Amino acid sequence: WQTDEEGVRTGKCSFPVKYLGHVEVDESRGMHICEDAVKRLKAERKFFKGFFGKTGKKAVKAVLWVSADGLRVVDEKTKDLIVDQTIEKVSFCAPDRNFDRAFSYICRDGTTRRWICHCFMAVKDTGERLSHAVGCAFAACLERKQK
Amino acid sequence: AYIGPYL
């Protein structure tokens, strides 16, 4: 996972994912706050698609890039930047106790003034591998912050 | 874990 670390510094670290979407959460941290947001999104995609079929609200095939500067999600189909999350406004991240491919992170949204979880399902990897990569990002970020 | 940098 050392290579994972150097990738984070060099903007080379990436993961094929399915971006589930975002949800309001009441705290900046919590291994269970995350598990919950996963269960919410997963139960929403089940509510829709009872009415709209395979179409909504479909999780989106993408690639997660993890850098010391930020996290980015790029759509595989359109190559459009789907998510540009500044690394400095991220509070917490975590894998999921009951969903082994799941990864999520909480972040502050300053306009709405609320905590927002952002869940993913890894395609080829485990949730914990992703969470590790983003911890390496967090680290490079903390190391660069001068006094 | 982990815990992010936010302040």
Numbering used by the authors:
A (entry chain A): 25 to 171
B (entry chain G): 1 to 7
The authors write:
Numb functions as an oncosuppressor by inhibiting Notch signaling and stabilizing p53. Numb can also bind to Mdm2, thereby inhibiting its ubiquitin–ligase activity on p53, which physiologically destines the latter to proteasomal degradation. In the four isoforms of Numb, the PTB domain is present as a short version (PTBo in isoform 3 and 4) or a long one (PTBi in isoform 1 and 2), differing for the presence of a stretch of 11 aa coded by Ex3. In this study, we demonstrate that the sequence encoded by Ex3 (11 aa) is responsible for binding to Mdm2 and recapitulates the effects of holo-Numb on p53 and p53-dependent phenotypes.
We determined the crystallographic structure of Numb-PTBi bound to a phosphopeptide (GPpY) derived from a “canonical” PTB-binding adapter protein at 2.8 Å resolution. In the two crystal forms obtained, the canonical PTB fold was extended by the insertion of the Ex3-encoded sequence. The 11-residue Ex3 loop was found to adopt three conformations, all characterized by extension of helix α2 of one or two turns. The crystal structure of Numb-PTBi showed that the Ex3 sequence connects the α2 helix to the β2 strand of the PTBi module adopting several conformations without altering the hydrophobic core of the domain. Ex3 contributed to the formation of a large positively charged patch contributed by lysines 63, 66, 81, 82, and 85 and arginine 64 from Ex3 and flanking regions in the core PTB fold. In addition, the “canonical” phosphopeptide-binding region of the PTB domain was remote and completely distinct from the Ex3-coded region. Indeed, by a variety of approaches, we were able to show that the peptide-binding cleft of PTBi is not involved in the interaction with Mdm2.
